Write a protein that binds this ligand. Structure first.
Ligand SMILES: CCCCCCCCCCCCCCCC(=O)O
Ligand SMILES: CCCCCCCCCCCCCCCC(=O)O
Lengths: 59, 256, 270, 56, 59, 270, 56, 256
């Protein structure tokens, strides 16, 4: 959960060298990102998740 | 000498050779196989058509356009009208199968694009309106690809399925679908992709018409973008091979 | 069970490239932080225990509750057994396509007076009965009906002031596991009910007062709690996104992927 | 017919006995730690090496 | 754009000068809206504490 | 464990001087009473046991209590977990800079009628629920809100007339120990909250009635009791002098060093 | 898997057993008597002798 | 499987991966190292910041145009404003270092061009007029690239340096510079180039602000030539990593 004490850090991506494209090839590209946990990953202290809501029992 | 870009697959009569590809993702790590006699239930002797069944099929190729949301097939009923595997499906009460999916979309070096080939066991789609359920005609079609719809489906009294891509019809995050086995068709470094699915189901055998246990989905993340003058029409083609089929309980001809 | 060690590394110049790979193979790179930078030898005593399935699925949870009274129209409460009528439990089981486990039931019963003009109300200790009816069995339509004799059906007699009752149930499914998601119809014609509703027939659960207990009306509240044990799982999947709607089917209302924020550069949520 | 095992510590033994005739009555097993990531990560037929390029 | 596919895409375009910032996001895998609905995001929200090494794969 | 023996000594004339030293070295002289006088051999069987840390910190203590009712504005009680809202416990932990231990919680719940004109009040056995919410979790704003299902969060159902409930909790801190005193801010700019308030996020504790329980209003009282165990400590320090003021910070009101007396020679307190 | 120890007397044995799977459930340890005053008294680098003058 | 086109370099935190390159030219054949105790002079114990110093830095990328004559940097004072290596430079009277230079300029297959990366120990530039000498402001700039001038510099009373390329500022033949270590960035078969420079100097240690012992030069021989419609702006970027730094004689803060 968010707290200023332990706050994680930051991440950035900067052009090292501008995109070079030939003629007749499209100028703009796209880049997709991925996330995974390494083999040293671990967790603790199970709790509830705030995302899922409810009102009255489902029917 | 060798290469990792190239692969050749041979089942029965058919053969598929590809000079640009990646490795073959195998299931969860269980190579498909027949049924050991420890888990068996049916006491009739099973039919093993082998070459008559195991081989590659090619469904209808579907166009791929800049705005195209995506597509889904249902494997247990797609082939049902093709070949003996369509015939041996109608005459038996039970079947056990596993699938090798091979998707082929190629482009020149000047075509941007990215596709997502996932194979989703037991994909259960919702309904347009909240109360009803989808009709058997909407979730399926013979050999034909059903496609998504990019924007929300207006909810009337109809039975239509909910085709929004970002929910992927199952009401989950589309970005998370990669837990299931998958591969990335990428017009940059790839040409075709391949999947091998072992038999996944709660019970050791199943009826084929009732329960569609494996759903195939192709969702473009990065649309097709190309400068003018290059060829416009780029089709996608799917190839589906059963493996190690078995059948039990021969009965009369039909489904009803 | 323990976390792996992070092995130290000095500088590197070489043609072997850990930092590069191809995700198109559907292959998550195994690269560890020692590859792309310099690293000191470190022992980790962290343990993965609490992340195991057992500790994840095993907690008691309130699936459902009813109200039945001591007099008037509704004198007993009936409920069919599905986990899906409670939000937060149903989600915890939707990670896994095929689940296997042995339920442990616990009931929590409470009583409440109701406003009335009745004079000289004097309470006595109430006694609740809880009867389970496997499928197809006889269904009581009235509190005094013969079915409550429970010549067979497992039944529990409980009393206020005592500890909450508890009973354990083994694995009841026909197949080799419960099925959370089922694509198909119940009828060979691809008609009738669609979805998982067809697989689920668990029978029914009933409850009643044994004795009137007082002159004045009394309303009672019963609560069920599952506590899965000995769990096994198969074929994980993406968590559910859109809010639930119905208990019989996966139907959802289309909703965005995530929350939003300002321009991509912005470093804080909004 | 008792049994002995180890608790969960960080920086001991406990005696448990099964009192009932039905497997489903036994206490939960919290301690099974066995893990094999290979069934989700690395689901490929040709084993790939970290130290080498992916597509050669 | 969170209602479309474009939520997963990172625009990259040829500029006339170098050093522009492609993107950036804070690292708070259970809180920050970025990782919130991700796969890793869900599993965390059930747990209070964590440690390990997060990999980011780009393609 | 035992007291040391006092060894006997005869007279002495010699140039070795036990009775002299220099305290400027910050060195407490080890001199024992046998050095400065004549002493008889004596065996001491006194034991230091009850002075160990364990027996010192381990006693139950009442940290806090609330009031929540059966009807009206306040139907539940919420409390964040800090030891510092009770005087006499907080002081016992301020000897030690860094403390490590495993809490053992015990609740004591009582009920009280409230004056009203309601007629024909007839009680029933109440049932209290106590729910723990680790940080960041969902926060119920109303008694019937879905969060009370406790699909995960550890929760306790209790009944009047039974024994007081008890549960044990292990060591929850992130670091290698709890910290009683922390000098610094929460923000790299040396701004925002100062003091130990930043380190402490323990989550929150809630309680409610399960059932109304009667027609007439009822107010309840809950009490929490810590009982540290397995204690370890580090870096002792001076006990606190001036009376406490706030629970978030060490702020004090200046007060004298000791009590007073008459002229230095006077041998009795005043 | 029991254990035996000694009570607290002045001028006997008791049988304890741990019934739970979590270390924090075990009873308190009241009996650890280990003491080493050297970490507060005598915190000097040069060891000083009682029988000698402090500053020579 | 392997390739000679690909290389991965790791120092401290930073890492530089390149999928198209050539081998790494190492100095004159002496891999950089610390100071053996046979040649030592300073009797104070040297500081060895290691990871705090050794790592890669990236200076300002500079545009590359059809008419662009070239560029030069002075290594001992470039980094002086960057990182601890800039701090540990100001607080010591002595330093000993060696450099790994990595130059990155990429282009598509349709861009002609050739560059020359040389690393010149003790490049001593002349003056515009014959009598004067260059000012300390003209030979240097913080992190910024100074560039040549294609045609002769008119000689006034100023202190300006002589920037003609074909004399390379040192009054030698530019065509001969290859005796020093070098590599060729060539937009055809290459992408990036790499150099490793051991510590070269007359005396075993040196002051950093006084004496700039290593000069880096990038001179295009074949200008950039590309048909219209392709992207115009192609930057060049330089990466500079100290190696095995040492320092002596801690003193107050400044240079004066
Ligand atoms: C008094 C006896 C009470 C017995 C309680 C029996 C409850 C059965 C629980 C079945 C469990 C979860 C199953 C979901 C079923 C399905 O969808 O297939
Ligand atoms: C029903 C479950 C109740 C769980 C009770 C959890 C109480 C947590 C106790 C934390 C203990 C003392 C810590 C002071 C914290 C700090 O200042 O760092």
């Amino acid at each position: 959960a968010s707290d200023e004490y332990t706050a994680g850090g930051f991440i950035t991506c900067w052009y090292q060298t501008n995109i070079v494209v030939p003629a007749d090839a499209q100028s703009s590209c796209y880049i997709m990102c991925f996330v995974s946990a390494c083999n040293d990953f671990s967790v603790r202290l199970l709790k509830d998740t705030p995302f899922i809501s409810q009102e009255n029992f489902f029917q | 000498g060798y290469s990792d870009r190239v692969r050749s697959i041979t089942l029965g009569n058919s053969t598929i050779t590809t000079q640009e590809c990646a490795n073959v993702v195998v299931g969860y790590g269980v190579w498909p196989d027949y049924l050991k006699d420890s888990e068996a239930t049916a006491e009739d002797q099973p039919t093993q058509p082998d070459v008559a069944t195991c081989r590659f099929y090619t469904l209808d190729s579907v166009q791929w356009q800049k705005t195209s949301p995506g597509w889904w097939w249902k494997l247990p009923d797609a082939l049902s009208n093709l070949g003996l595997f369509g015939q041996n499906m109608q005459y038996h009460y039970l079947g056990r199968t596993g699938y090798t999916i091979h998707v082929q979309c190629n482009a020149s070096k000047f075509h941007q694009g990215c596709l997502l080939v996932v194979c989703v066991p037991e994909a259960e789609m919702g309904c347009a309106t909240l109360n009803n359920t989808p009709s058997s005609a909407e979730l399926l079609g013979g050999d034909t690809a059903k496609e998504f719809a990019d924007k929300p489906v207006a909810s009337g009294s109809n039975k239509l399925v909910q085709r929004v891509v970002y929910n992927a019809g199952m009401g989950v995050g589309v970005g998370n679908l990669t837990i299931f086995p998958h591969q990335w068709i990428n017009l940059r470094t790839n040409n075709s992709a391949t999947i091998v699915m072992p038999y996944t189901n709660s019970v050791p055998m199943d009826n084929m018409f009732r329960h569609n246990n494996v759903t195939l989905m192709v969702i473009p993340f990065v649309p097709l973008d190309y400068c003018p003058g290059s060829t416009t029409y780029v089709p996608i083609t799917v190839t589906i091979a059963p493996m190690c089929a078995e059948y039990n309980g021969l009965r009369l001809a039909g489904h009803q | 069970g323990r976390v792996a060690d992070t092995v130290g590394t000095g500088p590197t110049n070489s043609e072997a490239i850990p930092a590069l790979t191809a995700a198109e193979t559907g292959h998550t790179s195994q690269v560890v932080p020692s590859d792309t930078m310099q690293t000191r030898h470190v022992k980790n005593y962290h343990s993965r225990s609490e992340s195991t399935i057992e500790n994840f699925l095993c907690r008691s949870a309130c699936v459902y509750f009813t109200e039945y009274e001591n007099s008037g129209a509704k004198r007993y409460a009936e409920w069919v057994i599905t986990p899906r009528q409670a939000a937060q439990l149903r989600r915890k089981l939707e990670f896994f396509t095929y689940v296997r486990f042995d339920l442990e039931l616990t009931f929590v019963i409470t009583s409440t007076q109701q406003p009335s003009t009745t004079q000289n109300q004097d309470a006595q200790i109430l006694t609740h009965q809880i009867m389970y009816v496997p499928p197809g069995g006889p269904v009581p339509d009235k509190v005094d009906s013969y079915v409550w004799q429970t010549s067979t059906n497992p039944s529990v007699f409980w009393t206020e002031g005592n500890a909450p009752p508890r009973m354990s149930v083994p694995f009841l499914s026909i197949g080799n596991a419960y099925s959370n998601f089922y694509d198909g119809w119940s009828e060979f014609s691809r008609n009738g009910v669609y979805g998982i509703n067809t697989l689920n027939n668990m029978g029914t659960l009933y409850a009643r007062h044994v004795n009137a207990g007082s002159t004045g009306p009394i309303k009672s509240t019963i609560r069920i709690y599952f506590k899965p044990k000995h769990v096994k799982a198969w074929i994980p999947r993406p968590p559910r996104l859109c809010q639930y709607e119905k208990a019989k089917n996966v139907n959802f209302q289309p909703s965005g992927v995530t929350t939003t924020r300002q321009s991509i550069t912005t470093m804080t949520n909004t | 017919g008792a049994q002995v095992s180890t608790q969960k510590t960080g920086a001991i033994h406990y005696t448990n006995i099964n009192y009932y005739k039905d497997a489903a009555s036994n206490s939960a097993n919290r301690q099974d730690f066995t893990q094999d990531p290979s069934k989700f990560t690395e689901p490929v037929k040709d084993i790939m090496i970290k130290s080498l390029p992916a597509l050669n | 754009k969170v209602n479309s596919m474009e939520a997963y895409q990172i625009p990259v375009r040829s500029n006339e000068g170098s050093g522009t910032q492609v993107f950036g996001f804070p690292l708070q895998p259970g809180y920050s809206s970025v990782f919130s609905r991700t796969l890793l995001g869900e599993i965390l929200n059930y747990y209070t504490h964590w440690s390990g090494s997060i990999k980011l794969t780009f393609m």
